[PDB]
Structure formats: structure tokens, C-alpha cells
Structure 1
Amino acid sequence: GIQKTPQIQVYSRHPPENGKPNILNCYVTQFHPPHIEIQMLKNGKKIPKVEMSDMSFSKDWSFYILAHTEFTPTETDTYACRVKHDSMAEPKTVYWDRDM
């Protein structure tokens, strides 16, 4: 078909240190059509005010977007990015690994 399945990365702006506030990024790329849903999660809960960049596309015509929010990592708290897109039957979840 015409659909292009998004690629996803989850990562912080600055090197993670437990207890120090930081920015968590969810970087979603290479998808078509441009409509998309991105939710950022902490321990399964919706993170309330996730900032979303404006629509842009790359030279291969595929669209991309960066979601981000403020967060303070700890030892045990989990963070993930969950994406909904017409290229997939079900939403895709990618978990945050502080080493990547």
C-alpha cells in the first residue's frame, strides 16, 4: 500500500542522572500518511503536557516529528513512548533504556 511504518526512538536530551530533571524525547520518523498519535508514558500513566513539534517531512517524502516532555529519572520509574498510526494494526510501544 501507500503506508510507511514509523520508526521510533526514546532518549533523554542530557545524560541521565537519577533525581536531576531532564527532557525525554520520543523521535518518530519515516511514516506516511502524516496523521499520527503519540503518547508519552510514565509508569503506564499519560504524561499530561507533552510538547509536539510542527509537521515536517524529509527528502524521501516521509514525515517525522519529535515529542518531548520534562522528566526526572529515578532508579525504578519506567518511561515509554506509544505511537498509533494507520500503517499498524495496533499501537506500538517503545520503552526507555537509559543506556541507549
Structure 2
Amino acid sequence: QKTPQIQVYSRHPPENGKPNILNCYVTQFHPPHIEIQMLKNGKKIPKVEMSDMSFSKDWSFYILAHTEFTPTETDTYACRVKHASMAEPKTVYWDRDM
């Protein structure tokens, strides 16, 4: 049983008011059953697209979530992950730079 690593980064340079894409890359987990949400100001974003689940040479799973977003300096963004390996959801906030 292995704990998911979470990385949150933007497709294009984050400029306030310009539409962009936010990525949440979740890796190094086992078993494969996992729940992944992306959050804007703590609330679940509805239209989040998901890649097919796959796995690496070391057999650990990975998956990529993404959604449209427009960064501003009044909005936070996060990726929240529920998985058997952790007692509660793990949330990683977007760094605002990544």
C-alpha cells in the first residue's frame, strides 16, 4: 500500500485574468482506487477532466486531472485526494507560481 504524491501546476504562465489550465498530477499510489477533486476557494470544481489511469515501471499508479481556470489574486486553487493509504483527504494548494 502506497501514498499518493500530488503536484499542482499550470499549463501556461499564470497571468491574472487570463484563461489557463490547472493540472493535478497524482502519482506513486497503490491500490488504484482513488478519489481526486480540484477545488476553487475550497469548493469542488464541476467539469474536471481525467486521464486514463496508468502505471509506471515500478508498478505504482498515476493519473492526471485538469480543469480550465483563470487565476486572480482573490482565488485559491487546490487538489484534494482521498485514498485508502491515508486516514483523511490530502489537499495540496496551488503554489500560485507553478
| TM-score over 0.5 for the pair | yes
Alpha-carbon distance, 1:45 to partner: 1.1
Report how many aligned residue pairs link the two structures: 98
So what's the TM-score if we normalise by structure 1? Answer: 0.96
* Rounded Cα–Cα distance in structure 2 between residues aligned with 1:16 and 1:82: 21
**What SS does the aligned partner of 2:65 have?**
strand
Runs of 4+ in 1 over 6 A off after TM superposition: none
Residue in 2 that maps onto 1:63 = 61
Segments of 5+ residues of structure 2 without an aligned counterpart are none
Q: Distance in 2 between matches of 1:28 and 1:17?
A: 24
- Counterpart CA distance in 2 for 1:21 and 1:89 is 35
* 1:28-81 CA-partner distances (Å, limit 9, x unpaired): 000000010000000011100100000100000000000000000001200000
Deviation string for 1:14-37 (max 9, x for gaps)?
A: 110000000000100000000100
Unaligned runs of 5+ in 1: none
Q: CA deviation at 1:98?
A: 1.8
TM-score normalized by structure 2?
0.97
SS for the counterpart of 1:60 is coil
RMSD: 0.6
C-alpha displacement of 1:83? 0.2
**Distance in 2 separating the partners of 1:45 and 1:99:** 21
Pairs within 5 Å for 1:33-48 = 33-48=31-46
